[PDB]
Design a protein around this ligand. Structure first.
Ligand SMILES: [Cl-]
Length: 202
């Protein structure tokens, strides 16, 4: 008989702080799973990394022993979407105080707190392969300082990279979950579907 074809997408974070991420994932017809424990990663097709304060990330990763399991998840080819500070977890290099980063994307990132006194703002963005008129909500947005040749730039703001992709990794410095525009989440879910397709065949 038949099984569900719904993708299972994890959200790395605490129950009450990731409601908007759950909603964005579910709005696209995927099942959201709040991930705390590393075993919960095994059944997922993809993972959203919302991030949070550096100290909370440090504690969460250490307390739940997520570092190797996260690296394992990447090695299985499962797509991962870092948003806002979650982008830092995917980076190779950090400018400023050191914090958890897995070295998955060829980018150098810097926390907002380190750069300047940038007040939160909203800007219309043109996202390559996703669409125009996407409202990017920048609240405590990290800065992507540099990106290597293998990184696909999807959007810029004031010539700074604000959305990028490298293989199964997707990253943005804004909060796509704070708009009802589902085009970026759909783009990610498409990556997850393609990756699942591929794993099934070889
Ligand atoms: Cl910015």
């Amino acid at each position: 008989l038949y099984f569900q074809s719904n993708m299972k997408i994890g959200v790395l974070g605490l129950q009450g702080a990731v409601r908007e991420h759950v909603r964005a994932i579910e709005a696209c017809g995927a099942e959201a799973v709040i991930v705390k424990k590393s075993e919960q990663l095994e059944g997922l097709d993809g993972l959203v990394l919302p991030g949070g304060e550096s100290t909370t990330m440090r504690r969460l990763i250490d307390r739940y022993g997520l570092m190797e399991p996260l690296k394992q998840f990447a090695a299985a080819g499962k797509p991962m979407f870092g948003t806002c500070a979650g982008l830092i977890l995917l980076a190779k290099r950090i400018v400023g105080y050191d914090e958890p980063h897995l070295g998955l994307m060829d980018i150098t990132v810097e926390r907002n707190s380190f750069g300047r006194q940038r007040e939160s703002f909203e800007a219309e963005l043109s996202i390559k392969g996703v669409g125009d008129g996407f409202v990017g909500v920048f609240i405590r947005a990290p800065h992507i300082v540099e990106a290597g040749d293998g990184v696909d730039v999807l959007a810029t703001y004031n010539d700074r990279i604000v959305a990028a992709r490298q293989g199964q990794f997707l990253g943005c410095s804004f909060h796509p979950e704070l708009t009802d525009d589902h085009r970026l989440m759909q783009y990610f879910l498409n990556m997850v579907k393609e990756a699942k397709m591929a794993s099934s065949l070889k």
